[PDB]
């Protein structure tokens, strides 16, 4: 459905946001390094 497709697109965006958030977390590891 349209709502399901929008949620799936948002889920992909959330996964991309999680990857972006992981980069911020990885940045802390670089600072820890």
């Amino acid at each position: 459905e349209a709502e399901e497709k929008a949620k799936e697109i948002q889920l992909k965006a959330d996964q991309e946001y999680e990857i972006e958030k992981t980069n911020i977390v990885r940045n802390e590891t670089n600072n820890i390094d």
Binding site: A2, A6, E8, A13, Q15, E16, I19
Partner: protein
């Protein structure tokens, strides 16, 4: 199929099923074995109308053995019907996941044979790869690299094939590795997406445009891909905004707003620079203001539009009229901007124009020379740009006349004299006014 509910997918499946070859006929013509023919007949009864299950491999072998176009189309249609069916398709996907040879054979079958057969096989491969276990980035990349997929995507007349390809790419974009594969495919076939966006800005076409917008948004979800695509097409944001304004669909408008926000999102590199460039060239701020004034039924689309308008207002708050003038000069496009007719703006920017050894004056002289060279076409936009450049030169000569000598050395006077003989009445009047401001009374 993964997206068999789409009208284009249904049409492709019907076209594939139109060219149907009986398993017994193939066996009689030595195109398949008796066991292979029995397996193919069982699969046809199960899906086209008993599940082959382990007998799917003999059916695939018979399809490979039967090189005839009709037999390949029938096999592709049967595979698509099995994928659409809940009972079948999933077993084939599980078998392909367990045995990569079957998955490799399915990928090779995808985008091969007849156009309808190629579309059906690609849909079946996408449906098989939809499962996490059977997902393969390499298979998706190989299918995308096929010439049949590129032809289907670039088939402007065949809108159904382009819509199916865009939907398949959007569905594959969920997997991050397949998302990178889709980003590479977009980098390869950018002109097709640009043509689709232009057609949307200027049904099967609506569905194709929506699928292309969804794929673009999915690609822009990754900040690296969004930054790469931002520099790939500077007018992509303007085209997306124009399409969103023209289109009345709530979902399409929301997708366009999300794509625009992703390009200017802080995650993407040079977010502030990209936002400023968009607001300067594509007129993002007035478009966002108009969209905010307009009422949208969708709540998510309205929220996205409000966020985009807030971002555009924040970007334009730091920007000034000087930045807009610089962007217009860089783009070599002038349509009688309010700063051009604003006496106060010219008075407050006269020093800026003469700054850096009159760098702005030299750029304006170069633009005027280019317009004079382009004056043979004498287009309406070209005539307007020439008139605006002449007015700017007259203003820069009246105020801080030191730039007059630089313009004369750079052939500005010669360009004005040449424009004085232009056929266009407005261009001739502007050139006469510039000449009068130069040495005239």
């Amino acid at each position: 199929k993964i997206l068999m509910d789409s009208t284009h997918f249904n049409e492709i499946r019907s076209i594939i099923r139109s060219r149907s070859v009986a398993w017994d006929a193939l066996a009689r013509s030595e195109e398949l074995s008796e066991i292979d023919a029995s397996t193919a007949k069982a699969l046809e009864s199960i899906l086209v109308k008993k599940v082959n299950g382990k007998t799917l491999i003999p059916l695939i072998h018979l399809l490979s053995t039967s090189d005839n176009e009709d037999c390949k189309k029938s096999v592709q249609n049967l595979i698509a019907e099995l994928l659409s069916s809940d009972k079948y398709g999933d077993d084939t996907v599980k078998f392909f996941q367990e045995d990569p040879k079957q998955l490799e054979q399915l990928f090779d079958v995808s985008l091969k044979g007849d156009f309808q057969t190629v579309l059906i096989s690609g849909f079946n491969v996408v449906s098989l790869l939809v499962q996490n276990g059977l997902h393969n980035v390499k298979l998706v990349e190989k299918l995308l690299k096929n010439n049949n997929l590129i032809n289907i995507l670039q088939n402007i007349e065949q809108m159904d094939t382009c819509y199916v390809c865009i939907r398949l790419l959007q569905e594959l974009a969920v997997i991050p590795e397949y998302r990178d594969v889709i980003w590479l495919h977009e980098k390869k076939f950018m002109p097709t997406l640009f043509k689709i966006l232009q057609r949307a800005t200027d049904h099967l076409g609506i569905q194709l445009q929506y699928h292309s917008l969804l794929l673009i948004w999915l690609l822009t979800f990754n900040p690296v891909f969004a930054n790469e695509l931002v520099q790939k097409y500077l007018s992509d944001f303007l085209d997306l905004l124009k399409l969103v304004k023209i289109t009345i669909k709530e979902k399409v408008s929301r997708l366009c707003i999300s794509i625009i926000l992703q390009c200017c999102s802080t995650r993407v590199k040079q977010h502030k620079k990209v936002i400023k460039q968009l607001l300067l060239l594509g007129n993002a701020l007035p478009t966002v203001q108009s969209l905010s004034e307009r009422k949208y039924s969708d709540e998510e689309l309205r929220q996205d539009i409000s966020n985009l308008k807030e971002i555009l207002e924040n970007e334009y708050q730091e920007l000034t009229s000087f930045d807009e003038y610089v962007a217009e000069l860089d783009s070599k496009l002038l349509c009688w901007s309010p700063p051009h007719v604003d006496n106060g703006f010219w008075s407050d920017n006269i020093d800026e124009f003469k700054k850096d050894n009159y760098k702005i004056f030299r750029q304006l002289i170069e633009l005027l020379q280019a317009k004079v060279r382009n004056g043979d076409v004498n287009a309406k936009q070209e005539k307007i740009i020439i008139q605006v450049a002449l007015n700017d030169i007259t203003h820069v000569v009246e105020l801080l006349p030191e730039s007059i000598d630089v313009l004369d050395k750079t052939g500005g006077k010669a360009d004005i004299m040449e424009l004085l003989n232009h056929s266009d009445s407005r261009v001739k009047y502007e050139a006469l006014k510039a000449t009068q401001a130069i040495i005239g009374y």
